[PDB]
């Protein structure tokens, strides 16, 4: 029920992302009252217990912190930016915008695999990393 930590102030999120060491800071931009964003928050809550050792999730509200809306072009719901090691990582998953996941993951295990791949890429030092599962298609059929 959206009990994850939330950035009341915009600058607080900035220093929270800055205060990172050997961990990935998943800043989930959006609004809790949105239904798709509610599903994304529920998925993040489910993941949080399993991967709290290196993956920290820290939500934020666009209305509360609108200064970062124009910084990374935050104009969609469910947006996720893996701002890790003080470096905005390039997560490529077969999408045009390979630096933003703006829709709730269908399954928790997929998100866990994605976040651990992001951690591996960040620790290796590369600023870009690909996804084992391409999302160019939704596998609707």
């Amino acid at each position: 029920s959206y009990m994850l930590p939330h950035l009341h102030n915009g600058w607080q999120v900035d220093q929270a992302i800055l205060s990172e060491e050997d961990r990935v800071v998943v800043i989930r931009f959006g609004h809790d009252w949105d239904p798709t964003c509610m599903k994304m928050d529920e998925v993040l809550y489910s993941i949080a217990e399993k991967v709290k050792n290196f993956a920290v999730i820290y939500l934020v509200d666009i209305t509360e912190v609108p200064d970062f809306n124009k910084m990374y072009e935050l104009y969609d719901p469910c947006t996720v930016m893996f701002f890790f090691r003080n470096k905005h990582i390039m997560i490529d998953l077969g999408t045009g915008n390979n630096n933003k996941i703006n829709w709730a993951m269908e399954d928790k295990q997929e998100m866990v695999d994605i976040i651990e791949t992001v951690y591996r890429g960040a620790r290796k030092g590369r600023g870009l990393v690909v996804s084992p599962k391409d999302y160019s298609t939704k596998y609707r059929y």
Partner: peptide
């Protein structure tokens, strides 16, 4: 896919 998730979130919240 949010309708079922929306209702579950509404119930729990």
């Amino acid at each position: 896919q949010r309708v079922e998730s929306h209702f579950d979130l509404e119930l729990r919240a």
